[PDB]
Ligand SMILES: *[C@@H]1O[C@H](CO)[C@@H](O[C@@H]2O[C@H](CO)[C@@H](O)[C@H](O)[C@H]2NC(C)=O)[C@H](O)[C@H]1NC(C)=O
């Protein structure tokens with residue numbers, strides 16, 4: 031976290047910095063998407079955070 | 080029912096009203112998806 | 128004449144303070160600058176006839192050669208999308224000049 | 225899915241759901257027995273990935 | 274006038290930046306423009 035990496039979640043590969051979100055995801059959500067139709071948030075499988 | 084998945088979305092909200100379906104706004108959250116695959120032509124509720 | 132000029136300046140302050148109307152000529156430029164860029168952001172969501180608009184969703188699923196038959200679509204669309212925006216922007220720039 | 229003792233008739237084709245499981249497709253793909261193994265929205269080598 | 278960001282030390286312009294749609298500043302600061310005026 032707070033470091034640059036090649037991420038993958040579920041096959042949603044990419045590149046970025048991961049950081050703990052204060053986005054109050056409703057329990058059924060696993061993604062957030064930016065206006066660009068690019069992901070900007072993810073709910074980890076092993077850790078809900 | 081979408082493509083064999085029967086999906087239920089719901090909301091429970093407090094109110095104070097004697098007449099009609101409450102004018103106002105809210106969203107139903109997805110409660111459950113089931114892979115059931117059946118045809119549904121028609122439906123009925125259950126009382127107690 | 129001084130009283131009249133000072134009065135007229137008072138009427139400009141009131142005119143531009145009490146409502147927002149005259150500045151639409153400036154505002155429509157800042158609006159069009161943004162709207163064209165927002166459209167170019169949105170054009171990344173476009174499929175251009177590929178299996179996905181998204182690149183990794185192709186590259187994670189297909190090999191090298193079968194990806195390209197999708198990827199060159201996205202390239203062709205995105206390159207024309209930039210050329211469209213740049214044609215609009217060069218044209219627009221002439222007005223501002 | 226491959227080892228059932230009997231299969232179905234095509235006028236009445238069977239459909240088994242798969243979920244909540246781990247998928248080593250190299251089992252199927254490295255099995256010589258298959259006259260065809262053709263993938264349409266994915267390449268076969270990526271099925272493990 | 275009511276803009277949505279203007280290149281001021283980093284939202285429409287978070288997304289623009291995250292696609293390489295950069296907005297460069299003017300050469301002349303709004304103070305310089307006011308001074309000339
Ligand atoms: C570049 O990033 C650094 C952070 O690494 C910014 O420094 C922060 O500035 C704020 C506001 O003055 C302070 O509250 C923080 O404590 C600073 N953090 C650190 C570690 O220095 C800096 O402002 C950024 N510069 C620009 C131009 O955006």
Ligand SMILES: *[C@@H]1O[C@H](CO)[C@@H](O)[C@H](O)[C@H]1NC(C)=O
Nearest residue numbers: 073074075076077078079244
């Ligand atoms: C993943 O495994 C860890 C233990 O290895 C456990 O804490 C966690 O609950 C598991 N994930 C889920 C979604 O249960």
Ligand SMILES: *[C@@H]1O[C@H](CO)[C@@H](O)[C@H](O)[C@H]1NC(C)=O
Nearest residue numbers: 080083116117118119120121
């Ligand atoms: C479901 O069955 C009814 C009764 O035969 C039929 O009218 C309807 O077309 C069927 N729907 C689907 C999607 O098969």
